């Protein structure tokens, strides 16, 4: 699953950045 990239991976990364 390391090779699966989609919109949801962005939003989780922007969320992590915001909340930390």
């Amino acid at each position, epitope marked *: *699953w390391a090779s699966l*990239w989609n919109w949801f991976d*962005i939003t*989780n990364w*922007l969320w992590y*950045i915001r909340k930390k």
Partner: antibody
Framework: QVQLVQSGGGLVKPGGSLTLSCSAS????????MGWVRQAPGKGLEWVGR??????????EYGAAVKDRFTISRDDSRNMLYLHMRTLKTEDSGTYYC???????????????????????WGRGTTVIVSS | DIVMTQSPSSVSASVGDRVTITCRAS??????LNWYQHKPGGSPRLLIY???TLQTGVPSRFSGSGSGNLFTLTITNLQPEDFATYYC???????????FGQGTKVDIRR
């Protein structure tokens, strides 16, 4: 070109169970969120539920009318989406469409983590009739 | 928790006319709104997400506007294939409700 073909469903008496199936082709099933939408005869559209990728936890989320009764599941090796309907009611009759959902990240900093969510590709629909 | 009410439920028009469907939300939903086209005996078709962003492949005759709790779908130079039923949908709650409007069918005026 995206191709969704649905099967399953049909006639069943109230209180019974019924499984719908949606076969995907033309896109990366494993990397896509999927779901279902239904339309009772003479009525409008009504979201039923969605399911996430396996890596996202394969989380099944359902609408109020069907939560606790309908369950969604996926098969990434077979590229199949299933809608398991149990304890059916006459008001569950209608045309069920399986959908290929996708999202777009929101860029407004204060909403980082949120996404637009929509059904980008809809199947031809399968008819469900709950009657004795 | 979110209720969507479209208006009008029906509207008639001739080809080449400007059609304006409005969609109202029971609360503020920013720009988390979709529009769908549904022709009878056919699969629903996504037109607009993010309230105003056109989906790839949709004609530019369709434009989405509005923000908060009042949204509008406009179809300029109405065409024969555009005679169908249109729905709006909210996608605001993190716990998805994804509630549609009752729908709006566009008929041919005569």
């Amino acid at each position: 070109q995206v191709q969704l073909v649905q099967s399953g469903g049909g006639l069943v008496k109230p209180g019974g169970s019924l499984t719908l199936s949606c076969s995907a082709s033309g896109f990366f099933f494993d990397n896509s969120w999927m779901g279902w939408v239904r339309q009772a005869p003479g009525k409008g559209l009504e979201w039923v539920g969605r399911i996430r990728r396996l890596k996202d936890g394969a989380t099944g989320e359902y609408g109020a009318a069907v939560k606790d009764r309908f369950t969604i599941s996926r098969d990434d090796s077979r590229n199949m989406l299933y809608l398991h309907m149990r304890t059916l009611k006459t008001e569950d009759s209608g045309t069920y469409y399986c959908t290929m959902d996708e999202g777009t990240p929101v860029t407004r900093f204060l909403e980082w983590g949120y996404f637009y969510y929509y059904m980008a590709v809809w199947g031809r629909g399968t008819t469900v009739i709950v009657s004795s | 928790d979110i209720v969507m009410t479209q208006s009008p439920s029906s509207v008639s028009a001739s080809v080449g006319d400007r059609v304006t469907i409005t969609c109202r939300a029971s609360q503020n939903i920013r720009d988390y709104l979709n529009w769908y086209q549904h022709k009878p005996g056919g699969s629903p078709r996504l037109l607009i997400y993010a309230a105003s962003t056109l989906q790839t492949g949709v004609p530019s005759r369709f434009s989405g506007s509005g923000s908060g709790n009042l949204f509008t779908l406009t179809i300029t130079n109405l065409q024969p294939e555009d005679f169908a039923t249109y729905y709006c949908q909210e996608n605001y709650n993190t716990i998805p409700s994804l509630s549609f409007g009752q729908g709006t069918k566009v008929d041919i005026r005569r």
